[PDB]
Ligand binder design. Sequence first.
Ligand SMILES: [Mg+2]
Length: 498
Amino acid sequence: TSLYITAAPIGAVPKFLDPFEATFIPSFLLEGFFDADRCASIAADLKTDGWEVVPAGGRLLQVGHAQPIRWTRHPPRLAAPNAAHFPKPWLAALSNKLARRIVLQLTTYGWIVSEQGDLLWEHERQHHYLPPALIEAIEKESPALLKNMEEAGWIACAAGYWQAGKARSPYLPITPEAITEETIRSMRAGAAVVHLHTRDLSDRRRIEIPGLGVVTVGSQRNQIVLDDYDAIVPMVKKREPAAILNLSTSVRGDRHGARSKLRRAHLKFYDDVGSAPEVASLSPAAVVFQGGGGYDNAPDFLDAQFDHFERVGTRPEVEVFNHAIVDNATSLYRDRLLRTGKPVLFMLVAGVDQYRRDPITGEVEDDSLIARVVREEISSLLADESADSHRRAVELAIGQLRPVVERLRASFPVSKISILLPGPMQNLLVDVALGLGLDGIRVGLEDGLTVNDARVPGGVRKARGTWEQVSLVREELLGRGATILTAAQVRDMFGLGI
Ligand SMILES: [Mg+2]
């Protein structure tokens, strides 16, 4: 059965990282150049922005970065511009796990893999830091590598604060302009539908630290930003009118927003475009992440959502986070879902651990589509990094999902079902989707920040963008003999935007 790709370029969780910014702040600058409370307040802000305290033992490579106050008289100029790189044999000296650790960190900082599998940094400035734990691992596995790095200008550091960029990407789009650009690139790479979030950047600010420059903090909080969509919707459709926009109505990060009209205020007729958004998310039960941060979807709220979607001509995409949603969608909300138009759309949020809470006792229990114990087994299998364990993992995933797909298709014979998986589980994505006879596959920085790349040791790096993940999933699908639908084909067969 033919497939359409959904691109999900922004999401709620990951953050943008500027690879030009300092990634390490030594404690001596913070404690020496500010008084006790100002030093303490900055530090708290760094922790809020994901910086972590590290002891001495790290390495810092810096070029053209610091302004004057191994410094001289001025920061060290031990590294000549454009000279820094990690030749493939440097990384091939390491175990798979350690090589991957390094590549993942440097590609978070904007380094790229060449066609020769070298790691390159293609700019004339940087302030890139590796923590003591990593340097220790390298010194144990390959003392010679560390000496090569030091000779290239990787310099020992004291204690301080490290911006690892965990769950960050230098390619995450968080502005209307960046989101429009990525939306268009993902479509050109082959995505038929683009699933969007916006972010509130109103709290961003620059902290200036002498002997280092400026570090930028801010929540980048997931928020439905009406002015951003007022920009994005026409900006996209002036260039690509075929765009099938699927707007998040989620209030992840903000549970108090879950009853508000705001959750449908971006689902309006956009005059500049002559249309409402094609698709928007709808979850017919509370979404309670085992990891925290969920949001309710109350029956009265849902009634209002359905009325609104029907009125403006937006097709719900049912976000199947949990078994509660399957139960509810196939029973009480069945006829309401048919009213909003056929085919009814579903997205299996597979691989993400979920609770269901008992209203009476307040106790929670597992409600995941892939039961947590099974999900945990799958993760363990994927960690074996073997064909034999991968095959077992696919069986387990398929085994858990098959009854869910059968129930959805039994209740909704005219339906389209897609799947997503979190980044570290995505090697299963194609096998699982094809194995289940699904109509679609979703990828993007919302779900995972990485891609496989056999050219580089360790085999894994940060994606260059959602468009790249789209490109790679499209290529794998085509190679398996699959048919990929275009936006224009998806619009027609789904009867969307009408
Ligand atoms: Mg989303």
